[PDB]
Amino acid sequence: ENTSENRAQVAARQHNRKIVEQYMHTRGEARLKRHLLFTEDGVGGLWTTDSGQPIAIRGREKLGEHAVWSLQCFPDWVWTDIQIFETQDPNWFWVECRGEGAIVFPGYPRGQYRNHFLHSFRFENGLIKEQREFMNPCEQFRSLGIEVPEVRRDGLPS
C-alpha cells in the first residue's frame, strides 16, 4: 500500500543504499574521508580476527584516524564482485563481495591479499552507525606468509 509511512521507509532504504554503494566504491585517497559517512559515534572494524574478538574502531574521528593506517597497509585495495542486500529493516544492509590488493604489514613481508567478505551496515539518520567486516582470517594469514593451521575432517563423507 502506497502510504506516507511505506513511502518514508522506501526513501530511507534508497538513501542508505546509495551510501553503501559509495562506501564500497571508495578507493585511494578518498578513503581518508570515508569516515564522513558515519554518525559521530559510529563504529566500524573487523569482526573476524585470529583472537576471536572484534577490533572495533569507535567514533567518526577515530575512524578517520584509522583510515591513515588502512591506506598505508592496504595501499591499492579494491572491493570487487559487490552484491548489496537490502533487508526488511530499511536501516540494515548486508554486502557480499571480494577484495584484493597489496598487504603491507610491518613485521611481515609485503604480500598480495585476496579474500571473500561479508559486510554489515546499520544506519541511523542516513549515516552509518555500525559497519562490520567478516572474512576468513586464514586467507590473511596466507598473504602474510603465516602457516595456516589445518583441520582434518576424518570420515567426512564424500
Ligand X SMILES: O=C(O)c1cc(Br)ccc1N[C@H]1CCC[C@@H](C(=O)O)C1
Those residues with Cβ within 8 angstroms of residue 40's Cβ, 6 or more apart along the chain or in another chain:
59, 60
Q: Indicate whether 146 belongs to the interface with its own copies (CB under 8 A).
A: yes
- On the CB side of 149, CA atoms within 13 Å amount to 4
Among residues 15, 22, 33, 24, which one has the least CA distance to residue 117? Answer: 24
Q: Indicate whether 4 belongs to the interface with its own copies (CB under 8 A).
A: no
Q: Indicate whether 97 belongs to the interface with ligand X (CB under 6 A).
A: no
**Coil, strand, or helix at residue 49?**
coil
Q: Indicate whether 77 belongs to the interface with ligand X (CB under 6 A).
A: yes
Report the chain's terminal Cα–Cα distance, integer Å: 50
Q: Indicate whether 55 belongs to the interface with its own copies (CB under 8 A).
A: yes
Shortest distance (Å) from residue 90 CB to ligand X? 24
Q: Indicate whether 124 belongs to the interface with its own copies (CB under 8 A).
A: no
Q: Indicate whether 144 belongs to the interface with ligand X (CB under 6 A).
A: no
Shortest distance (Å) from residue 69 CB to ligand X? 8
Those residues with Cβ within 8 angstroms of residue 123's Cβ, 6 or more apart along the chain or in another chain:
12, 16, 19, 90, 91, 92, 93, 129
Name which position in 15, 30, 36, 50 contacts its own copies (CB under 8 A): 50
Residues that bind ligand X (CB under 6 A): 45-46, 55, 70, 74, 77, 99, 133, 140, 153, 156
